[PDB]
């Protein structure tokens, strides 16, 4: 029953931290850097912010900018083959969850060209006690994650997910050997995020912290960070959304908050909100953060039925939502009211139906969604052990915009 | 103005985590382990808890158990020479701040026998590139007090025997590769060690929260350490091993305070405590306990503001009442600390800690000057004058509250 707190060697942050952190990459003696990113970030000059600094110091650079919305095995393999040819001694992921997750798997494949993806996907889908260990990492290259959304927190986590394009099946990988060697959290890179990305990333971060706090693997080492992320998000996410680049402090606070939520869930994991959000995302092509935003309130209601209900009340107290003499039930209602108001000002629809999913389509798939969500690796940390029938009820309630009632 | 959050690769915790973490040391392929500890911990079988597990797996072991309070250059050099002869691939510090700090410097000397101590002391006193670490050996810190948090920090201090001068080293290459926080190792701590370590931890978290280098990445951890300490230190001191939950919570709290100050640093409480400790041989945690309330009063002087931050701590700890103004929140924070100190048997003044008046008066100017110069001073939210530090020291000597 040993627990842990496992983070990157260095997390660097503050506006302008990117070039300063890169100077350490240089002085560490790195000579060949592969940047892994997407087309938007390349076309908008974000990768140049990395390569210009490295080139000035005589570091050879290559940029792979072909990561798309969800990392696919074909793209990961292509990136790995570029690594095989270019031979980087540092891989630098630049972007949101998609480039960061893709880069982690490219890194494994580069370190171990003998290893088939099937071996990785079937053996290392979760964190658990094992006899056979993850293949040794960081021999050919170190991994740096530069996050440009606020955010997935992938820059500090042992997690990656890749879609097998041949079948559409998503494969989660998890091992602390995939935790980046360095995370760079520079809010200059998120000043121009559109409103939808700001909202979805921010509510993803809220969900990460919320699930990490009530997880059966929560501890005194993660609780403070989960609560801090929630406080920062409560205090700055509205302004970040409304004002964007006009309020750089709010953008910076939220960028930090998403990483801090990462610190918590990297160690405490998540719950059934993520389980269900994964399946909604895959089935209906709803962005991850939106899917979480749609489900989180009903998951709280469900989990609140070391009771989770006491923990939710602790969050209410931390966020200043409760009044003296409030009972647990009332504190939870106040937590829910806060979340509902936050969702409203961030333009989140009130139901999956209002997010554009047709009723017949939903009903035809809801049983499969419920079964798959039960089976999801995220379910194991949820404080309430679910039945498939209960997850179905949550999904239906969320589709029709009803509050879950036990 | 880049900031950072830098911790050991792994922090492992919970009662019984030591043997479980050691199994990972074994499976990582370590073959030769040097344990660095003190005589008390060796004689009470604490080192055997490590060596028995490693030996059973065919790992060669050696123990250096000669670390004393205030590690000296002679002792560090002797430990380094043992490392040079034994050739460990892992160094495992076992103990409080003295073995942990000593082990960090032994590690550097073993990794770099070519390097003169003067080079290290004069170049790396304050957060050159540090000479590459972790080539010959990884560093594991196993803390047995609650505590210094040294198991997660980039700090070590050694005394030059020849002169009595203390040399702080600070670099993230000294951060352990692994910290092990196993409260089974602290169940039998005596009351004074419990008190002094606990109040050291309170001070670490308090100074890290109001430090000019505080950030959103450390603040939550500083507040968590303070909440854990408020909630469990009274029971830990009173009940000891009869309340293992409290002992466990406080052991975690000391490390969590470490997480905060490893990154946000400290302030003038530590600056003054270092000098009181060196001059009068007052234990570090006792020295901090004697000074912390007056440092709060000093730092809280009205013209973010430290005073707002202290009020935030009061709110976090549930010490404030609705409608309380900042001043009243701070008075409630101070009252909490005073009551905690009372339970823990902390003297009400430096005089009552056994320091003779003539001795104190003869040294107070030097204490004030040295405290100003201490590396810890730079992070303090109030930029001090030597005259003000002198006043704090005198007030604390005579048991008076500092008044602006
Ligand atoms: N299933 C899981 O466990 C899990 C968890 C996290 C991540 N993921 C995956 O990662 C992705 C989520 O990452 P994300 O939400 O951060 O976004 P993303 O990486 O999918 O990026 C989404 C879009 O935003 C753009 N973008 C990125 N940074 C920007 C910026 N600063 N300004 C403007 N546009 C920017 C990207 O170029 C892209 O077009 C999804 O594909 C999701 O499936 C999955
Ligand atoms: N800034 C820095 O670099 C830094 C960091 C840490 C500590 N330090 C210094 O090191 C010291 C910190 O020491 P500490 O408080 O951990 O104590 P310590 O290591 O000096 O040990 C104090 C005594 O407690 C005993 N002891 C330790 N663990 C015990 C246990 N579980 N049960 C019973 N007895 C036990 C030891 O054997 C010793 O006799 C201070 O002097 C401090 O200034 C400096
Ligand atoms: Fe998520
Ligand atoms: Fe201290």
Residue numbers in the entry:
A (entry chain A): 450 to 754, 769 to 869
B (entry chain B): 450 to 576, 581 to 756, 769 to 869
List sentences from the manuscript.
The bifunctional alcohol/aldehyde dehydrogenase (AdhE) comprises both an N-terminal aldehyde dehydrogenase (AldDH) and a C-terminal alcohol dehydrogenase (ADH). AdhE is a crucial enzyme primarily in alcohol metabolism and catalyzes the conversion of the high-energy substrate acetyl-CoA to acetaldehyde and subsequently to ethanol. In vivo, full-length AdhE oligomerizes into long oligomers known as spirosomes. As has been shown previously, the alcohol dehydrogenase domain of AdhE forms homodimers that are essential for the formation of the larger full-length AdhE spirosomes.
Here, we describe the atomic structure of the cofactor-bound ADH domain from E. coli determined by X-ray crystallo­graphy to 1.65 Å resolution. The two forms superimpose well, with a root-mean-square deviation (r.m.s.d.) of 0.32 Å over 404 Cα atoms, and interestingly there are no obvious local differences in the binding site for NAD. The benzamide part of the NAD molecule is less ordered in the electron density, and it is likely that this part does not form strong interactions with ADH, allowing the moiety to exhibit a number of conformations. This is reflected in the B factors of the NAD moiety, where the adenosine diphosphate has an average B factor of 26 Å2 and the ribose-benzamide end has an average B factor of 49 Å2, which is higher than the average B factor of the protein model of 28 Å2. NAD interactions correspond to 3% of the total accessible surface area of ADH. Additional electron density was observed in the metal ion-binding site, as previously found in gADH, where it was identified as Zn2+. As ADH has been described as being reliant on binding to iron this density has been modelled as Fe2+, although it may also be a Zn2+ ion as observed in the homologue from G. thermoglucosidasius. The metal ion is coordinated by Asp653, His657, His723 and His737 with additional waters.
